[PDB]
Design a protein around this ligand. Structure first.
Ligand SMILES: [Mg+2]
Ligand SMILES: [Mg+2]
Ligand SMILES: [Mg+2]
Ligand SMILES: [Mg+2]
Ligand SMILES: [Mg+2]
Ligand SMILES: [Mg+2]
Ligand SMILES: [Mg+2]
Ligand SMILES: [Mg+2]
Ligand SMILES: [Mg+2]
Ligand SMILES: [Mg+2]
Ligand SMILES: [Mg+2]
Ligand SMILES: [Mg+2]
Ligand SMILES: [Mg+2]
Ligand SMILES: [Mg+2]
Ligand SMILES: [Mg+2]
Ligand SMILES: [Mg+2]
Ligand SMILES: [Mg+2]
Ligand SMILES: [Mg+2]
Ligand SMILES: [Mg+2]
Ligand SMILES: [Mg+2]
Ligand SMILES: [Mg+2]
Ligand SMILES: [Mg+2]
Ligand SMILES: [Mg+2]
Ligand SMILES: [Mg+2]
Ligand SMILES: [Mg+2]
Ligand SMILES: [Mg+2]
Ligand SMILES: [Mg+2]
Ligand SMILES: [Mg+2]
Ligand SMILES: [Mg+2]
Ligand SMILES: [Mg+2]
Ligand SMILES: [Mg+2]
Ligand SMILES: [Mg+2]
Ligand SMILES: [Mg+2]
Ligand SMILES: [Mg+2]
Ligand SMILES: [Mg+2]
Ligand SMILES: [Mg+2]
Ligand SMILES: [Mg+2]
Ligand SMILES: [Mg+2]
Ligand SMILES: [Mg+2]
Ligand SMILES: [Mg+2]
Ligand SMILES: [Mg+2]
Ligand SMILES: [Mg+2]
Ligand SMILES: [Mg+2]
Ligand SMILES: [Mg+2]
Ligand SMILES: [Mg+2]
Ligand SMILES: [Mg+2]
Ligand SMILES: [Mg+2]
Ligand SMILES: [Mg+2]
Ligand SMILES: [Mg+2]
Ligand SMILES: [Mg+2]
Ligand SMILES: [Mg+2]
Ligand SMILES: [Mg+2]
Ligand SMILES: [Mg+2]
Ligand SMILES: [Mg+2]
Ligand SMILES: [Mg+2]
Ligand SMILES: [Mg+2]
Ligand SMILES: [Mg+2]
Ligand SMILES: [Mg+2]
Ligand SMILES: [Mg+2]
Ligand SMILES: [Mg+2]
Ligand SMILES: [Mg+2]
Ligand SMILES: [Mg+2]
Ligand SMILES: [Mg+2]
Ligand SMILES: [Mg+2]
Ligand SMILES: [Mg+2]
Ligand SMILES: [Mg+2]
Ligand SMILES: [Mg+2]
Ligand SMILES: [Mg+2]
Ligand SMILES: [Mg+2]
Lengths: 46, 122, 393, 240, 159
RNA sequence: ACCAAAGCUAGCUCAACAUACUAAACAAAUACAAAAAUACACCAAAAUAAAAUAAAACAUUCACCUAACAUUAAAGUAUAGGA
RNA sequence: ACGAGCUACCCAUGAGCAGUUUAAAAGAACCAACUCAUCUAUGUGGCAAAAUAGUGAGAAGACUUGUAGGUAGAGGUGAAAA
RNA sequence: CUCGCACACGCUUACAUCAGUAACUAAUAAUAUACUGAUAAUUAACAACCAAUAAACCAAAACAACACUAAAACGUUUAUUAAUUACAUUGUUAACCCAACACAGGAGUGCACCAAGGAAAGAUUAAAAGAAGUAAAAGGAACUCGGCAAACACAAACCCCGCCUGUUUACCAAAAACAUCACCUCUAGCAUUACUAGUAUUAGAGGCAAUGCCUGCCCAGUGACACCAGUUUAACGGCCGCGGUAUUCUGACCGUGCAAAGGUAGCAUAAUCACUUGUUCUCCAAAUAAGGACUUGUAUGAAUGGCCACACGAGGGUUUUACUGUCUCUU
RNA sequence: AACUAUUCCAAAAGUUAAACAACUAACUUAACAUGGACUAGCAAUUUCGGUUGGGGUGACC
């Protein structure tokens, strides 16, 4: 009906989807971390 | 958009999220669900009697400093093992097999405080 | 045969061992040196781990056969929670016992004497029912787990109040959760009734035998019913580690040595977690029997003999709305043979203390049709209850 | 991702065991089978489909069991019976008139004289008369029953040749088996299961059946009334 | 792994195509290793064994690049070791058989230091060399004691 | 007269050289939901680059296009190509 | 590569449905909470990148809803509206 | 005037005390829960963390007496071992979250309907037009595409289409579209991850839409079975003419051509090319509307279903009553 | 093309006679599974010549 509230916060969902452990379990994720490390990001992951 | 930067802490999550602030565990969970403390895991402060002794938190200003010599393995070898070794080689009683009389320890696993895997905090 | 695991579930078979382990006289090179997995190197094989000092909690479970009490004879145990498939039939056969419909006439005479009633019976018992079923809790409709023990204890108190008139009742003491182990051998099958019942009323002085000799000798001629396809052991616990010693929950020199009444509550909310009335009857048969057998081997001894002095024990049981009354007379310590004198049991079954209960007024078309309280009340069942409590005096 | 199947329990129990439906999804999570999901919640009763199953390997002989109760099953169309003998109970598929408090024989023994067939009776095929009605039919001896388990179905023993039975499946196809294989004698329970009338779409949903698609497909060549000569006879007999 | 034209007309579609070797399960007997291995081989492998006149022959007589298998190289490392060692455990009961077999392969015999490094991946090699080089660093009490004995014997010999 | 305006520094760019090539900083904590001392396991893996585009369309083809061998010529020659 | 914290459909696991009418918790009836979104008027850089006011439909069911999981773009999902 | 207190989730100090506010936040001020600074603070009993392995148990929750069908969440006991020893660790503020905002929107649960929470108006004036409301003489749909909206009304009838409750295009379509009980075709003779721990009264792939009466003729083409023959239409799809005849219009009959069969029953100016505002009757003072009949519709028509019917519908049409500022004609 | 099923030849494992007449061939095939074909399914890539008293239809080139 009205839109834009699409983000409904959960810490569990957040850290399961985007968390450090999640990024490190697949080789693709590890490449994500690696890219951000390269670009010098302050936060590599959630 | 949540918070990425701020550090993750027990204050942040759900009820199910409990993460200590880094104190060390003193025990385990027992039968009744009640928690059991092991007297051995709780640090026992060893405190000497301070009353009868003379030293203070500060030093007199006119008292001199000294030439700064960092203690080396060598100097410590010379203040302890060197007099005894020279004494027993000059007497011909020196035994290259057992050095244990001079204070050398072959292995660390016997004694209470071991140096290499480092059994004691402080 | 259709096997019941599923390959997908069962713990995955070990990875096929590295090819370098097939070559004779060759030392494989493994990552075991660097203390962590590396690709490019062969998988190390390790000895089953032996932490030279054993830790009580984290050790592997000791295999059962290592126990000191281990025996090769399978012993069938009956504990508090076992259901018998054929309840009273099996119970009887394991107990070598004949069944009689009513209660002993001693008890009925004890029950029908107008002297033996409380002050106002209907008033007090309707109150104990209302209390247990409604008033004892803060909630609208209390569960069975609370109200069954509450009603049995309420009735125990209504009876206990009679200690004024017959002051022999002070010779009793109540006990909760005693170890009971009664081992006996029946027809090449080893049986042990072992466990805890809920509540046990003990007396200082024993109970007078309730069957005339005509009944005992008429019991000598009775043929035990048999269920052919079903083994009589069905529903018990096959057990390879057990002790054979006669044990009643008390040590030597116990001031109240003689078991009087056993109380069995069924407090569980769900139907399937309660006993069928029949299985309950079985339960209290076998447990009454063990309780008796214990004494019988204390006052006489392990020798198997017919008894010149019969032991008598009682038992009551409950839905909390439904009561099972039992009196047991143990005449025999030799159950090995089928052919001798049989023990006796009187069972008054399915005695309703009340029909139904309403904790809220039931309302139809905006009027009050049925008020709050019990529907129907049998003073009879409480009368029998009182009798069985009064059997000593 | 990966899901584990609920179908892991090693030891047989008569007690109902809890199970997880998965509407049509394979272990990857994709839809394999369409139109399945969300029925009533169900427990599962383990059924022993090997009818001849000696309790102990010590006494091999033909044994007899009592029927305790006959209960509805959520998992299959037939009604099932709780059956106890010796120290053991099991769920078996109930034959049409099987009732509580009953006696049922399980036998591996053939003989020259055949047998007068009751309902709950399980016999090897070779031991039966040649016109008998059979259900719960093994394929290879020692395998366990697969064929003819559905509600109110019955096959028929057709003939016996060369130490081998030839039977007629409910689809009216013929099946060749060793005569050493066990079958139960009779029609399976609940014969009116055919004539049940689902009243409302809701009722279908209770059975865990999601509606068909709304997409309109034109009928193809596969459609029409095809009259095919009945298929050749399946033989599970392995020739030397 | 490659591409192909359909019909072999250059003017047709160009299509990715991969040609796979036909594999067989075959058990082979090694003389020097006295064992039967169940191995997946090709018909080309069998023809090469045939052509080199023995299994063990084919494995000793072929260079690393031509076998292409880590397993072939481990087989070879094994029987090469068994040849340089003259390992008695080959045929424990019969020195006749043993000398007989060790005889025909005498052309390939290499010293021992070479023989254990033959079939190794660079990883396995680096590991091996790390293990031969493994030493718990020597206590400074030892070294200081030897310096002291040197000085004391040179103080004893100067007078 | 307001709003404004002016600096010349911070550093950068491109090469040269060069040793050789994952800087600095590690007390504790860090792959539980990274930064949470402490319990019986599992662990791990590879398959051709494609297309936009050029051919005035598009179908075979289309340099370079994350594979060390540079430089002066031979030579835009021999050859290859819906030639 | 990243996305199913919105939405489609599932899986686990919880939670709600008062009064009235009926032999009945019958995808019955009246009507709240609840869920939808009929018709009109407002509003149209608005309170709002879909709302407000009235009015409506369902309201023990193919019902609503919380939490945790799944399916991924040559795909998924779909009581087909591409 | 009334969305109140708490918890979960989520937010993270925005909370508290003192002081300050020229300017910065508040869409203005006054001053301050929101701007500034300094100083403090939520204390476990609630909550999180908080055993395995064998063994007996077929018996729903619904006030549970006992049952219904869709067959149902939730544990006892017995045995074997479970470090045994005060005080462990962590959540405790708020006026808060998702919507770029101090947003009339979105937000689970338990109790409350007030005892708790709050303020529609910065100050005036009382022009037009606009919004929201209350009332209205006589009339009562004459308004209008339509009784849209409104009403002191809150009733009855008849058609079309869909059987029904349900579902759908989040943000222009809620329907006659989809699904659906039922009926039908096809395809399968079977074992450890789907179907399915199932086994042809079963399971998939579809079609059509309950019920009732029915579902006519066609296998030549195109499919699909049968690897060719041959079989199949509740498979894709098809189901005709010209001439001569009863005094006369018609044509039972006659001739002949072509087809695989030549459109059967029914219904019909239809939601059905055009002709079309077909023709007639009823309804109205008056009707291209509505209903009823006639009806070649040469382009209806039988599970791409044909015909009747109950009940149902925020579906689309028509009548009557009543009601009314829709309108006469505005105040 | 790939892939999914079908059918076939070859590959691979085998098996039989010592074959027939007078004075070498033939057959076999459990699951995998390769090379080359066949028939379908599911698909992949690519394109909609121009003129035209606007385009389309017709006409033309
Ligand atoms: Mg957004
Ligand atoms: Mg962010
Ligand atoms: Mg927390
Ligand atoms: Mg919280
Ligand atoms: Mg404590
Ligand atoms: Mg099912
Ligand atoms: Mg059933
Ligand atoms: Mg269907
Ligand atoms: Mg359809
Ligand atoms: Mg181009
Ligand atoms: Mg160009
Ligand atoms: Mg182009
Ligand atoms: Mg390219
Ligand atoms: Mg050429
Ligand atoms: Mg979700
Ligand atoms: Mg209600
Ligand atoms: Mg309803
Ligand atoms: Mg509204
Ligand atoms: Mg209004
Ligand atoms: Mg409303
Ligand atoms: Mg309503
Ligand atoms: Mg309604
Ligand atoms: Mg998810
Ligand atoms: Mg494309
Ligand atoms: Mg798609
Ligand atoms: Mg459509
Ligand atoms: Mg924020
Ligand atoms: Mg403040
Ligand atoms: Mg301000
Ligand atoms: Mg609070
Ligand atoms: Mg104002
Ligand atoms: Mg005005
Ligand atoms: Mg107005
Ligand atoms: Mg008005
Ligand atoms: Mg008026
Ligand atoms: Mg008009
Ligand atoms: Mg007009
Ligand atoms: Mg209206
Ligand atoms: Mg009206
Ligand atoms: Mg009206
Ligand atoms: Mg409808
Ligand atoms: Mg939907
Ligand atoms: Mg819409
Ligand atoms: Mg919607
Ligand atoms: Mg609607
Ligand atoms: Mg709409
Ligand atoms: Mg439809
Ligand atoms: Mg029909
Ligand atoms: Mg119909
Ligand atoms: Mg037809
Ligand atoms: Mg045809
Ligand atoms: Mg034909
Ligand atoms: Mg008509
Ligand atoms: Mg028309
Ligand atoms: Mg037509
Ligand atoms: Mg059709
Ligand atoms: Mg049509
Ligand atoms: Mg109806
Ligand atoms: Mg509607
Ligand atoms: Mg209507
Ligand atoms: Mg509707
Ligand atoms: Mg006026
Ligand atoms: Mg295409
Ligand atoms: Mg191309
Ligand atoms: Mg063109
Ligand atoms: Mg043009
Ligand atoms: Mg033109
Ligand atoms: Mg023009
Ligand atoms: Mg043209």
């Amino acid at each position: 009906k009205a839109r834009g509230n699409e983000y409904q916060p959960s810490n569990i969902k957040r850290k399961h989807k985007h968390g450090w452990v999640r990024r490190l379990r697949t080789p693709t994720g590890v490449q994500v971390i690696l890219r951000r490390m390269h670009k010098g990001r302050k936060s590599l992951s959630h | 958009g949540a918070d990425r930067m701020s550090k993750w802490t027990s204050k942040r999550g759900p009820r199910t999220f409990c993460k200590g602030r880094g104190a060390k565990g003193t025990g385990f969970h027992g039968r009744d669900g009640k928690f059991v403390q092991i007297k051995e895991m709780i640090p026992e402060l060893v405190v000497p009697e301070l009353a009868g002794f003379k030293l203070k938190p500060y030093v007199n200003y006119r008292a001199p400093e000294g030439t700064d010599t960092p203690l080396t393995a060598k100097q410590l070898f010379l203040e302890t093992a060197a007099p005894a070794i020279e004494k027993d080689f000059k007497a011909g009683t020196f035994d290259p097999e057992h050095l244990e009389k001079y204070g050398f320890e072959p292995t660390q696993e016997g004694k209470l405080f071991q140096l290499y895997p480092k059994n004691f905090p402080r | 045969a259709y096997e019941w695991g599923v390959r997908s579930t069962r713990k995955p078979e070990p990875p096929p061992l590295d090819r370098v382990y097939e070559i004779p006289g060759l030392e494989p090179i493994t990552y075991a040196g660097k203390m962590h997995f590396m690709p490019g190197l062969a998988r190390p094989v390790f000895p089953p781990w032996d932490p030279g000092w054993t830790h009580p909690k984290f050790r592997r479970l000791p295999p059962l056969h290592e126990h000191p009490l281990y025996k090769d004879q399978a012993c069938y145990v009956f504990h508090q929670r076992c259901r018998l498939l054929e309840g009273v039939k099996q119970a009887l056969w394991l107990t070598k016992t004949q069944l009689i419909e009513g209660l002993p006439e001693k008890v009925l005479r004890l029950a029908d004497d107008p002297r033996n009633h409380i002050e106002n019976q209907d008033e007090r018992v309707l109150n104990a029912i209302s209390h247990a079923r409604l008033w004892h809790s803060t909630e609208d409709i209390p569960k069975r787990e609370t109200y069954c023990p509450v009603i049995v204890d309420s009735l125990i108190q209504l009876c206990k109040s009679q200690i004024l008139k017959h002051p022999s009742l002070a010779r009793r003491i109540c006990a909760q959760n005693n170890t009971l182990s009664a081992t006996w051998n029946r027809e090449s099958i080893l049986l042990q009734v072992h466990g805890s019942s809920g509540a046990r009323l003990n007396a200082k002085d024993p109970l007078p035998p309730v069957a005339s000799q005509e009944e005992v000798e008429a019991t000598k001629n009775h043929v035990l019913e048999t269920f052919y396809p079903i083994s009589p052991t069905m529903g018990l616990q096959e057990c390879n580690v057990y002790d054979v010693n006669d044990d009643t929950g008390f040590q030597e020199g116990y001031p109240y040595p003689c078991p009087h009444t056993l109380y069995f509550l069924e407090s569980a909310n769900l139907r399937p977690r309660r006993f069928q009335p029949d299985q309950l009857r079985a339960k209290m048969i076998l447990f009454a029997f063990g309780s008796a057998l214990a004494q019988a081997r204390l006052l006489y001894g392990n020798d198997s003999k017919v008894l010149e002095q019969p032991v008598v024990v009682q038992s009551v049981g409950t839905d909390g709305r439904l009561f099972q009354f039992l009196v047991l007379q143990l005449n025999t310590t030799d159950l090995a043979s089928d052919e001798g004198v049989k023990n006796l049991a009187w069972v008054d079954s399915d005695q309703l203390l009340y029909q139904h209960f309403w904790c809220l007024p039931v309302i139809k078309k905006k009027v009050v049709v049925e008020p709050v309280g019990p529907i129907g009340f049998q003073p009879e069942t409480f009368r029998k209850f009182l009798a069985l409590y009064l059997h000593g005096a | 991702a990966t899901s584990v199947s609920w179908k892991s329990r090693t030891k047989y129990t008569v007690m109902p065991v809890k199970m997880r439906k998965s509407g049509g999804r394979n272990h990857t999570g994709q839809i394999q089978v369409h139109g399945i999901g969300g029925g009533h919640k169900q427990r599962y009763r383990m059924i022993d489909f090997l009818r001849f199953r000696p309790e102990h390997e010590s006494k091999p002989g033909p044994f007899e069991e009592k029927v305790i109760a006959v209960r509805y099953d959520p998992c299959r169309s037939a009604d099932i019976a709780l059956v106890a003998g010796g120290n053991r109970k099991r769920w078996i598929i109930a034959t049409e008139n099987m009732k509580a408090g009953d006696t049922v024989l399980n036998s591996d023994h053939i003989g020259r004289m055949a047998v007068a067939a009751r309902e709950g009776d399980a016999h090897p095929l070779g031991a039966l008369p040649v016109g008998t009605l059979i259900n719960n039919v093994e394929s290879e001896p020692g395998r366990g029953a697969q064929y003819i388990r559905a509600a109110g179905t019955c096959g028929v023993l057709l003939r016996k040749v060369n130490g081998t039975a030839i039977i007629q499946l409910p689809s009216k196809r013929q099946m060749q088996v060793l005569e050493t294989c066990i079958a139960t004698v009779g029609r399976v329970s609940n014969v009116d299961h055919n004539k049940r009338v689902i009243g409302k779409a809701g009722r279908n949903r209770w059975l865990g059946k999601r509606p068909n698609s709304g997409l309109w497909q034109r009928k193809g060549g596969w459609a029409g009334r095809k009259i095919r000569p009945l298929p050749p006879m399946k033989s599970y007999v392995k020739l030397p | 792994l490659g591409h192909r034209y359909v019909n072999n007309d250059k003017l047709s579609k160009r299509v990715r195509k991969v040609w796979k070797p036909q594999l067989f399960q075959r058990e082979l007997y090694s003389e020097i290793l006295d064992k039967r291995f169940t191995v997946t081989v090709t018909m080309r492998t069998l023809d090469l064994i045939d052509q080199a006149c023995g299994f063990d022959f084919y494995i000793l007589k072929t260079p690393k690049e031509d076998l292409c298998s880590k397993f072939g190289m481990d087989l070879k490392r094994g029987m090469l070791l068994r040849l340089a060692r003259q390992d008695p455990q080959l045929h424990p009961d019969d020195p006749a058989r043993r000398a007989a077999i060790y005889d025909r392969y005498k052309a390939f015999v290499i010293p021992e230091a070479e023989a254990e490094w033959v079939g190794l991946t660079l990883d396995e090699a680096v590991e091996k060399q790390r293990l031969l080089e493994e030493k718990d660093p020597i206590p400074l009490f030892k070294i200081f004691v030897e310096e002291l004995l040197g000085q004391l014997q040179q103080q004893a010999l100067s007078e």
